[PDB]
């Protein structure tokens, strides 16, 4: 790289072909003097935010507008303005055609100065008739104006072989121009006089003229292909004001405009389209004794020389210039910083380097010198700006061989974080409530009521209430009661009686409702009543009439449901009355209130019917009371569980009241209660480790989000410190998804990196010894403008896929199986090893898969070994030392890749594993455990050819049964202890999926379990 604002290194370009000039004849002057609708000598400029015409750029025939705006008196609107100009130029056209016959003056060149001054005098009514004899030129363009005798000092005057002429009005200001921040800058070329261009034929005569003439503001040359002959331009002392924070003067604005125009022209060079001029830069010639170093005129002379040599700006410029952009560019150029380029602005001549791509030396005889001394090390190419995105995009790292200490990267990321901020939280658990049910069977088991479990004693503590309130605040639903009622009715109308053969509950039922609440942001009733009455559930028949009781009715009556009350006898009754409102926060009064609700709901049941009771706090007294009283008077029952919010509440449904029978509790109910309570314990232990709902993050939380935001000026090889900081963030993140965003923030190009941490990430940070470093090339190439978004904690809003959920299940099985301080080996990790986040920190690993990995070699505390030699083959496992081998989601892939059967692939695997020294092992096998349901859209089997056909991945794998698998295992080892681990109904595997900040599902976790039952994981201990 940079001078004071960053220019684009590593490339430089310039246009090549220059158009041959064209003499301006009288027919061209007439065709420009009338205004065709296709082309006219003015182009309108327009505002950027309003699309309003606020300025007019002028061209060749009308460029002599040197007088004040009041002398002309143009109308302010653009349409009336251009109509006025067309009419008055048509009058001037008739005048000049009346003077000169076209048929005899068709093919002679006309005089440009007289043309511009004639238009400017006719628009100002300033005695233009003495210009008409000078319109046709002879013997050259300049000597007629020198040796003429017509006295007119408003436009030109001669000093003896040096003509001076007052140029003016490249641009024209309209009425609605108001110095707005999206107005186009006019570069002080709309005033009466911004410069006085002095024309001659030879630069020696010009330099002799500027001995006695002053050079206060400094003169400017052109040297490439000037407008009307070889000349200097001296700007006056007027100011430009349409750039807010600082005011520049005239020649500063001219040099700035031409430097920016050449910066525009250097990018758009395509080596086949021609340009009208190779460089438009000025290269100041005499005023350098007055404007010195660190001034803006000197710095723009430096940038003018760099533009002539052919450099490019590091950031792209707009097609239409704005005052904000111009202000930002000049505010970048007046700053601190040295000139890093070897190009220094000279005084005798404009210099160009040895390998600069400009070919201006060949098309110009005087001005340019190919300096063989200084060289430019950068290569030659054009600019390639990549197209920006509005959303942040994902980034993946690639590592290198170098390494540093961990605490250095920790200190650098502590310098670079913007971590004390408040992220948006998201949602833990999305979808419909999961349903867990069990029903009475006559032939299971009789158990006593004292053997069934109860609530844990540490239930009403602060951390437990914290976990339940966090899960209830983060879990997103519609209506809790609606989802619970749909679940309990769909699982209630499946029951059949042992007395008759149809079912218990039918249509036309005349039900009763207990515990009604009014407010549900809809009707003033629970939201299941009218769809269940209209039959919209379509798993139910509609009842005949629904009456609703409870403390908070709107279309019923308020009673106390504990002790009885005047009412009818209802054939069915659904009750929700809960033990929180009337119970005074103790289990004794809560259990007694449960007993009273059971008494009232039994006496209000109209015998030969059914009832549903909810129980918040199932305790031993409740189980003993219901086993002593309710079960002898009930034909059959079931107790189910809709799972929407993490609590221990269950539902009790009894069928066939007031018949004498003998019913007890069963071992299946015991298993259901153990599963229910252990599920609550695991999910509460997960929920007590998350941060709160609306927290700010400080870094001390074991899970959360962290960002850094370091800046990158243009194209530049980033330093050591940025690389250490980003690599330390990568070591802190541990191969989660990482998203970046590149955007200009407060006048600085800066990039952010947003990702999340986990306890598995902390385990991986405990694995390694030295901090490795990334390859920064994938970030150095990026030249986009990636607009950021506000950070969220749970990014996945659609939920997790069942393949991901199945992968987390197998990962939890591996992390539960692997003990501490044990040698392991894995078959088929991939380019990244997920097993590094699973095994403990002291346990060494040696993973093998054919594909080359991406995890770094070296810099670990314990032994890690990466090798790629097609593990299914033979002759490699002799030197390999391990205690347990793991093959996850890869044995079927290898069997499909070798196009061989699953039994033969498993036999080849066990033949190559007999040579190892391991004793325990667990691998994933493809085996049907239950009867096949051939899952629609996720796993559609082939019964004949025995393939799997995953439709989401487009792959299929062979399989065989556990009989054949056990046959080959017992043929391999006679003393092997084969076992099959069951699935987790208790959701114990959800630790890795929630602590790594992923919203799971409901339907996809159901599909993931029903997919796991068709491809389980077996464990082999070859001893015992």
Ligand X SMILES: C[S@@+](CC[C@H](N)C(=O)[O-])C[C@H]1O[C@@H](n2cnc3c(N)ncnc32)[C@H](O)[C@@H]1O
> Which residues in 302-361 contact a second copy (CB under 8 A)?
335
Residues 749-808 contacting ligand X, CB under 6 A: 807
Tokens of 350: 């404009």
CB-nearer residue toward ligand X: 329 or 871: 871
Q: Judged by CB, which is closer to ligand X: 89, or 838?
A: 838
The number of CA neighbours under 13 Å toward the Cβ of 284 is 29
Stretch that binds a second copy, among 100-108, 619-627, 907-915, 989-997 (CB under 8 A): 100-108
Q: SS3 for 470?
A: helix
Instruction: Provide the mask over 107-146, with x wherever binding to a second copy is found by CB under 8 A and - wherever it is not.
Output: x---------------------------------------
The distance of closest approach from Cβ of residue 140 to a second copy in the complex, given in angstroms and rounded to an integer, is 19
**Residue 551 contact, options a second copy, ligand X, none, Cβ 5-8 Å cut-off depending on partner type:** ligand X
| Shortest Å distance, C-beta 992 to ligand X | 12
Three-class secondary structure of residue 413 per DSSP: helix
Query: Residue 362 half-sphere exposure, CB side, CA atoms within 13 Å?
Result: 6
- How far is it, in rounded angstroms, from Cα 614 to Cα 699? 43
Residue identified by tokens 């007046």 is 334
Q: What DSSP string runs through 841-862?
A: TT--B--B-SS---SPSS--SS
**For a second copy, the closer CB: 101 or 149:** 101
- Rounded CA-CA distance 32/173 in Å is 22
Is residue 747 within the footprint of a second copy (CB under 8 A)?
yes
Work out how close the CB of 112 gets to ligand X at its nearest, in angstroms, rounded to a whole number.
47
Output the smallest distance, CB 5 to a second copy, in A: 12
**Does residue 888 have a known ligand-binding role?**
yes
Region from 84-92, 560-568, 623-631, 926-934 binding ligand X, contact rule CB under 6 A: 560-568
Considering the complex, state which of residue 140 and residue 335 has its C-beta at the smaller distance from a second copy. 335
Map the footprint of a second copy across residues 692-731, applying CB under 8 A: 711
Spatial neighbors of 922 by CB under 8 A, at least 6 apart, are 813, 814, 817, 884, 886, 981, 1017, 1018, 1019, 1020
589 binds ligand X (CB under 6 A): no
Q: Are 344 and 303 in contact (CB under 8 A)?
A: no
Q: Report the partner that residue 107 touches, choosing among ligand X, a second copy, none (CB closer than 5 to 8 A by kind).
A: a second copy
Binders of ligand X among 452-481, rule CB under 6 A?
481
Q: Does 415 bind a second copy (CB under 8 A)?
A: yes
Instruction: Tell me the C-alpha to C-alpha distance, in Å, between residue 562 and each of 290, 549, 565, 596, 597.
Output: 101, 12, 9, 5, 5
> Which of 34, 870 has the CB closer to ligand X?
870
Distance CA 42, CA 55 (A): 10
Gap between the Cα atoms of 210 and 899, Å rounded: 90
Q: Give the Cα separation of 646 and 642 in Å (integer).
A: 10
Q: Which of 164, 578, 813, 837 binds ligand X (CB under 6 A)?
A: 578
- What letter does residue 960 receive in the DSSP assignment? -
β-bridge partners, 158: 163
Q: Of 800, 797, 801, whose CA–CA distance to 937 is shortest?
A: 801
Are the CB atoms for 510 and 545 separated by under 8 Å?
A: yes
Is 437 marked within a binding site?
no
Q: State which residue, 109 or 738, has the beta carbon closest to a second copy.
A: 109
| Residue with Cβ nearer a second copy (102 or 867) | 102
- Rounded alpha-carbon distances, angstroms, from residue 935 to 135, 635, 803, 1017: 92, 36, 14, 19
Instruction: Give residues 727-746 in contact with a second copy (rule: CB under 8 A).
Output: 745-746
Binders of a second copy among 492-521, rule CB under 8 A? none
446 binds ligand X (CB under 6 A): no
Q: CB of residue 722 vs a second copy: minimum separation in angstroms?
A: 13
CA gap 225, 18 in Å, rounded: 10
User: Angle 371-373-375 (CA atoms, 0-180°, nearest 5)?
Assistant: 90
Asked whether position 420 contacts a second copy by CB under 8 A, the answer is no
- Binding ligand X (rule: CB under 6 A), the pick from 829, 864, 926, 1004 is 829
**Which lies closer to a second copy via its Cβ, residue 219 or residue 333?**
333
Query: Closest approach of Cβ 748 to a second copy, in Å?
Result: 6
CB closer to a second copy out of 109 and 213? 109
Q: How many residues bind ligand X (CB under 6 A)?
A: 33
Q: Which residue is nearest to ligand X (CB)?
A: 551
Q: Can you list the pairs that 594-603 forms with residues at least 24 positions away whose Cβ atoms lie under 8 Å?
A: 594/622, 594/625, 595/622, 595/625, 596/562, 596/563, 597/561, 597/562, 598/625, 598/626, 598/629, 598/630, 600/561, 600/562, 600/563, 600/564, 601/514, 601/573, 601/575, 602/629, 602/630, 602/633, 602/657, 603/564
Cα–Cα distance for residue pair 682/305, rounded to 1 Å: 71
Which of 692, 698, 704, 693 is CA-nearest to residue 732?
704
Nearer to ligand X, 793 or 835 (CB): 835
Residue 550 in the binding site for ligand X (CB under 6 A): yes
User: Can you read off the two tokens belonging to residue 72?
Assistant: 């002309």
Residue of 128, 223, 471, 871 interacting with ligand X (CB under 6 A)? 871
Binding-site member from 207, 347, 463, 560 for ligand X (CB under 6 A): 560
Structure tokens at 1006: 């159901």
**Shortest separation between residue 336's beta carbon and a second copy, angstroms:** 9
Angle 545-547-551 (CA atoms, 0-180°, nearest 5)? 165
Cβ of residue 753: shortest distance to a second copy, in angstroms? 16
Q: Which residues, other chains included, contact 457 with Cβ-Cβ below 8 Å and sequence gap of 6+?
A: none
Under the binding rule (CB under 6 A), the answer on residue 334 touching ligand X is: no
Residue (667 or 745) nearer to a second copy, CB: 745
Name the residue nearer to ligand X (CB basis): 190 or 576: 576
Point out which residues bind a second copy (CB under 8 A).
101-103, 107, 335, 415, 711, 745-748
Point out which residues bind ligand X (CB under 6 A).
481, 515-517, 526, 550-552, 560-562, 576-578, 581-582, 807, 828-830, 834, 849-851, 870-872, 888-890, 893-894, 897
**Which residues participate in the annotated binding site for S-adenosyl-L-methionine?**
481, 513, 517, 520, 551, 560-562, 569, 576, 578, 582, 849-851, 870-872, 888
**Which residues participate in the annotated binding site?**
481, 513, 517, 520, 551, 560-562, 569, 576, 578, 582, 849-851, 870-872, 888
């Amino acid at each position: 790289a940079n001078v004071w604002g960053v220019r684009l290194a590593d490339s430089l370009s310039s246009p090549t072909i220059e158009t041959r000039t064209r003499h301006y004849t009288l027919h061209d002057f007439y065709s420009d003097l009338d205004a065709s609708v296709g082309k006219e000598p003015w182009r309108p400029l327009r505002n950027q935010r309003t699309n309003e015409i606020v300025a007019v750029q002028l061209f060749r025939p009308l460029q002599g507008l040197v007088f004040d705006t009041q002398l002309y008196g143009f109308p302010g609107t653009f349409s009336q303005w251009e109509q006025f100009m067309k009419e008055k130029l048509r009058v001037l056209k008739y005048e000049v055609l009346r003077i000169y016959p076209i048929s005899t003056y068709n093919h002679d060149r006309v005089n440009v100065f007289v043309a511009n001054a004639l238009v400017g005098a006719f628009l100002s009514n300033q005695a233009f008739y003495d210009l008409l004899p000078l319109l046709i030129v002879n013997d050259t363009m300049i000597s007629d104006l020198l040796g003429t005798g017509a006295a007119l000092s408003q436009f030109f005057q001669s000093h003896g072989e040096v003509l001076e002429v007052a140029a003016g009005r490249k641009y024209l200001q309209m009425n609605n121009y108001s110095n707005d921040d999206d107005d186009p800058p006019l570069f002080a070329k709309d005033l009466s006089d911004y410069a006085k261009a002095f024309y001659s034929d030879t630069y020696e005569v010009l330099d002799r003229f500027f001995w006695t003439h002053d050079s206060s503001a400094g003169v400017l040359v052109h040297y490439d292909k000037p407008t009307n002959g070889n000349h200097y331009i001296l700007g006056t002392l007027t100011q430009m004001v349409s750039a807010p924070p600082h005011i520049i003067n005239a020649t500063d604005a001219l040099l700035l405009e031409s430097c920016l125009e050449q910066f525009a022209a250097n990018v758009r060079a395509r080596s086949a389209q021609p340009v009208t001029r190779l460089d438009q830069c000025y290269h100041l010639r005499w005023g350098a004794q007055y404007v010195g170093e660190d001034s803006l005129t000197y710095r723009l002379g430096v940038l003018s020389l760099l533009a002539t040599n052919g450099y490019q700006l590091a950031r792209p410029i707009p097609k239409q210039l704005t005052n904000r952009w111009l202000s930002s560019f000049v505010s970048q150029v007046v700053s601190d910083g040295i000139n890093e380029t070897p190009l220094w602005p000279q005084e005798r001549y404009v210099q160009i380097a040895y390998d600069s791509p400009s070919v201006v030396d060949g098309a110009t005889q005087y001005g340019y010198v190919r300096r063989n001394q200084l060289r430019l090390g950068m290569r030659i190419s054009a600019l390639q700006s990549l197209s920006d995105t509005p959303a942040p995009v994902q980034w993946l790292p690639q590592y290198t061989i170098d390494q540093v200490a961990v605490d250095e990267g920790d200190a650098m990321v502590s310098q670079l974080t913007q971590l004390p901020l408040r992220p948006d939280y998201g949602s833990i658990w999305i979808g419909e409530a999961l349903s867990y049910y069990v029903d009475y069977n006559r032939s299971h088991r009789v158990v006593l009521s004292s053997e069934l479990p109860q609530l844990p004693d540490t239930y009403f503590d602060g951390d437990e209430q914290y976990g339940r309130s966090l899960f209830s605040l983060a879990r997103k639903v519609g209506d809790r009661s609606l989802v619970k009622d749909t679940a309990v009715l769909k699982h209630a109308y499946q029951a059949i009686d042992p007395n008759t053969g149809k079912e218990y509950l039918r249509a036309g039922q005349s039900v009763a409702y207990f515990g009604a609440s009014a407010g549900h942001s809809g009707a003033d009733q629970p939201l299941v009543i009218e769809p269940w009455m209209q039959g919209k559930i379509s798993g139910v028949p509609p009842p005949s009439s629904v009456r609703q009781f409870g403390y908070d009715v709107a279309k019923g009556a308020i009673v106390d449901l504990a002790r009885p009350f005047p009412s009818g006898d209802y054939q069915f009754v659904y009750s929700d009355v809960d033990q929180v409102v009337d119970g005074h926060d103790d289990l004794s009064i809560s259990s007694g209130l449960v007993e009273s609700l059971l008494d009232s709901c039994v006496h209000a049941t109209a015998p030969g019917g059914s009832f549903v009771m909810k129980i918040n706090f199932p305790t031993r007294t409740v189980w003993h009371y219901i086993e002593q009283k309710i079960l002898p008077n009930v034909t059959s029952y079931m107790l189910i569980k809709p799972f929407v919010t993490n609590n221990v509440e269950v539902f009790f449904v009894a069928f066939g009241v007031h018949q004498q029978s003998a019913l007890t509790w069963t071992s299946g109910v015991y298993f259901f209660l153990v599963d229910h309570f252990y599920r609550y314990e695991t999910l509460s232990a997960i929920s007590r480790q998350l941060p709160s709902f609306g927290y700010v993050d400080d870094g001390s939380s074991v899970t959360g989000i962290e960002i850094i935001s370091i800046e990158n000026p243009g194209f530049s090889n980033m330093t050591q410190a940025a690389r250490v900081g980003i690599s330390g963030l990568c070591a802190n993140v541990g191969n989660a998804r990482k998203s970046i965003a590149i955007y200009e923030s407060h006048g600085a190009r800066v990039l952010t990196i947003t990702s999340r941490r986990s306890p598995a990430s902390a385990r991986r940070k405990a694995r390694l010894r030295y901090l490795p470093l990334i390859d920064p090339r994938s970030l150095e190439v990026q030249a986009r403008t990636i607009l950021p978004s506000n950070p969220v904690l749970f990014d996945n809003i659609n939920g997790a896929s069942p393949h991901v959920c199945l992968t987390m299940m197998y990962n939890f099985e591996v992390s539960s199986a692997v003990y501490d301080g044990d040698v392991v080996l894995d078959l088929g990790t991939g380019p990244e090893a997920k097993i590094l986040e699973l095994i403990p920190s002291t346990s060494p690993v040696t993973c093998v898969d054919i594909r080359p990995t991406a995890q770094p070699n070296g810099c670990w505390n314990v032994r890690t070994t990466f090798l790629e030699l097609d593990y299914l083959s033979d002759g490699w496992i002799t030197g390999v030392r391990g205690d347990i081998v793991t093959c996850m989601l890869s044995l079927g892939a290898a069997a499909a890749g070798k196009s061989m059967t699953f039994d033969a692939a498993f036999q080849q695997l066990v033949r190559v594993l007999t040579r190892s020294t391991a004793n325990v092992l667990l691998i994933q096998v493809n085996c049907p455990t239950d009867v096949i349901r051939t899952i629609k859209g996720y796993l559609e089997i082939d019964q004949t050819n025995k393939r799997y056909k995953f439709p989401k991945f487009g792959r299929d794998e062979p399989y065989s049964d556990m009989d054949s698998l056990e046959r080959i295992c017992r043929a391999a080892w006679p003393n092997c202890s084969i076992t099959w681990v069951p699935l987790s109904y208790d959701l114990r595997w959800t630790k890795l999926a929630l602590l790594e900040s992923t919203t799971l599902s409901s339907a996809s976790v159901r599909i993931a379990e029903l997919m796991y039952k068709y491809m389980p994981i077996m464990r082999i201990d070859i001893h015992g």
